[PDB]
Symmetry: D3
Subunit: 153 residues, 6 copies
């Protein structure tokens, strides 16, 4: 069951605009994490408001939703051991100015509000996010040919 952990990764509108979709996918793909769902979407405010439900009511919330509807996003689900936490380490710290070289934000970003990508903060949050952005039918079950070389039996 451990290798079956999943996380939700989203390239934010700035990531798409700046031509960083392939780079975000590369960090996960080259690591041995398995891509099990993927779509480009122009979500409406209602969907984004549920994604960010924990931030409702905060003064910056309306601006956040407006910004998140200003361009398309790329939604992904990745599967593998500890992918939630590893996913977060690969993105960098929330603030690019605190992120290290070698991370996505540390390599490509400057402002916290333009930090190109979102990753689930916990397995529980991942499960919520995955079900919000994808139907079960959109999640593609497959077995990697490199499984026995990425994981110990």
């Amino acid at each position: 069951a451990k290798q079956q952990e999943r996380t939700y990764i989203m390239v934010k509108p700035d990531g798409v605009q700046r031509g960083l979709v392939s780079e975000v996918i590369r960090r996960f793909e080259q690591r041995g994490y398995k891509l099990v769902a993927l779509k480009m979407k122009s979500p409406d405010a209602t969907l984004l408001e549920e994604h960010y439900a924990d931030l409702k009511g905060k003064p910056f919330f309306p601006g956040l939703i407006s910004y998140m509807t200003s361009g398309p996003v790329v939604c992904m689900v990745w599967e593998g051991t500890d992918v939630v936490k590893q996913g977060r380490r690969m993105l960098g710290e929330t603030r690019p100015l605190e992120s290290n070289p070698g991370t996505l934000r540390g390599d490509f970003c400057i402002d916290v509000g333009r930090n190109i990508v979102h990753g689930s903060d916990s397995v529980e949050s991942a499960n919520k996010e995955i079900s919000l952005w994808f139907t079960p039918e959109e999640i593609c079950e497959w077995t990697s040919a490199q499984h026995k070389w990425v994981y110990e039996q």
Copy 2:
């Protein structure tokens, strides 16, 4: 109307297995072409049989369909001037042994039956393929920040 041209690009099951999704996307993204639709899918045989309708009744057709259902694929639509023909030039010749270094198949492939990616062969094919794989609601309308720097006025 020439900038509006679109083509259908699909990472085949071998491209997904070999971890080349990011590389295929990169070739288009870095060129200035605009990603307008994207999804991972496990298509059933009926959708693939329509995609490959012109090959129906060829002796290799059954094996092609079985192969194309042997892992997930990544479906994409790219937009920009001459994208059908340029997309094909970037993929390389159909046969990897005839493809030049610098092209996707020339860099990454050996066998014509394991040639990692599909690109529409013509504007007519592209229009058919786009509407076969995607509904209009899955196509994302957006304007790239770099438009005026990729295209002349």
Copy 3:
């Protein structure tokens, strides 16, 4: 004589805006060619009008000049055997739609009017271009540590 050939390479305002300066430099640097002059510049119209003198009078000319002053450019001189021709090959055809994958234009662009970079079309052209865009004191004389491994 051969090894001292020089060409003029210029990242155009779209190349700079699209963050392709490092990539243009890499194609030459990794090839073993020697960078002997480099500067970012905002040329005035009078210089651009001399650079494009043969085009003066064409309907698109004023627009070309305004476009070429719309952002800074990166000016370079590269040195090495057959650098003019090899530089043009590495850039790809002038028209990106006719340029092959593996070339700068084949990899990165689409419209001939947004074709990110210029390289001299011949040694004759290079001599003219280098003299127009650089002063002799801006050319840096040096010997590469890999010279004996790049050249026989």
Copy 4:
């Protein structure tokens, strides 16, 4: 203003000799920092002596000046929020043996005396360095097409 902060980055003779000019530029360019000045130069000993003014008197000083005049350098000015501090971070520690993988020095260097690049250590030093290595006429202002995607709305805009 915050977004207008600038730093001086210089590829040292070893960085040029080892073919690392493009890689140094890439780290800044891909990050959204704006290149506003750039030139290759073979500076006179006196310019370098002024650049390292506060190292005069040190036994290694003559040696440092001779080394820094041993090949051309590439001078740059980069602009963006926190560019001085982020620039240093991207370069890695001064000592390559203390620098982490992913930084320029950690990926490409071994010896502190051959550490390929210099970055201003502070805003004060950066302004001094920019003025020493470039004239105001060499600074080429511009606004990036990607500005609104690299930066959020700036605060206290008049």
Copy 5:
């Protein structure tokens, strides 16, 4: 003398299977370390048991040896100042889940049992490993053209 320090680096079977030989070499080559010995080998269990002598008796030991003989390895010797310590830092922590982005394991690995590469842990163990895996006749003496630009003399 300090510039003459050497370490033993080995791409394990998973690193070879996953196509990561060029990437391991790149990390050392681009840093200015000097490659002085290199070979692909399918070692006998006897050689591996001596390599892993400190682990004899552990319950996983027989399984480790059978794993390490399940595909070829690539053996290397690198030379330069502090290469043992720097080499380990470039590989990352033993555990990929603790390794930082930018390191080999942090970029490409997930399971500690499939952590693609080995590096000597000390000058003492490096000297033992080098003489275990290579004869003196396989070590190539040469001087890099970039020596005076990598090192201050």
Copy 6:
């Protein structure tokens, strides 16, 4: 068919210029299988047979010797290296991306299957060939 092998060698200039990883990458990423590899300082006698001023350069530093396996690897290998003369080679090839002089063209590749078999047996012993099966075999090749 898929068992075809070729001999690729990084010449002393390729090693000196830090291009070993890149030569390996071009073959590795293509799906070709590395079955033999070694760094060596061959003597004049091995070099004279191989080539039956050149011998001096070819002994001026170490080389990296390789055997790659896969369908059409001799011809595809040559294509990936580029034309013998770098000034005739296209961008995307190793010599077209990294070289200028024919006498400093960083790499050698067998020109035919017959030459490859001869070169492999000249530069490697049978015991140095490592046979294995790639986990990606069924995705690189059609059954």
